[PDB]
Amino acid sequence: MKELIYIEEPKILFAHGQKCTDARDGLALFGPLNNLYGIKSGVIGTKQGLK
Amino acid sequence: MKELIYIEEPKILFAHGQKCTDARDGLALFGPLNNLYGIKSGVIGTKQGLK
Numbered sequence: 001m002k003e004l005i006y007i008e009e010p011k012i013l014f015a016h017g018q019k020c021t022d023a024r025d026g027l028a029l030f031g032p033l034n035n036l037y038g039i040k041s042g043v044i045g046t047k048q049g050l051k
Numbered sequence: 052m053k054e055l056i057y058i059e060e061p062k063i064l065f066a067h068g069q070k071c072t073d074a075r076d077g078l079a080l081f082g083p084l085n086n087l088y089g090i091k092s093g094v095i096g097t098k099q100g101l102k
Contacts, residue, residue, distance in 0.1 A: 037089040 011019045012026075015033055020026030043050050062070045063077065066084060071077035094101055 037091055040088070 009021050011021050012023065013019050013033075014026040015030040018026065018030045020029065060072045062072055063074060064070055065077040065081040067081055069077065069081045071080070
């Protein structure tokens with residue numbers, strides 16, 4: 001009869017200084033940390049790739 | 052007596068297929084051809100230069 005010890009979850013910090021435990025939920029509750037403005041993309045491939 | 056000839060202004064093109072002889076006027080009235088979303092800039096310099 002050996003003994004087990006349990007360790008609590010660490011939590012990861014998001015915008016507004018708000019701590020959640022799951023990445024998805026607190027990206028959908030407070031969003032990312034830094035403030036970009038938009039992502040300009042380049043695409044290299046065939047016509048179907050662009051489609 | 053020597054004879055001169057006149058040549059008319061060429062005109063330039065802007066958004067919505069509108070023509071003008073000046074770039075400042077046509078940019079203030081109509082706007083540019085393509086659609087950017089925003090300029091993300093990198094600034095390398097001293098602190099006072101950044102300010």
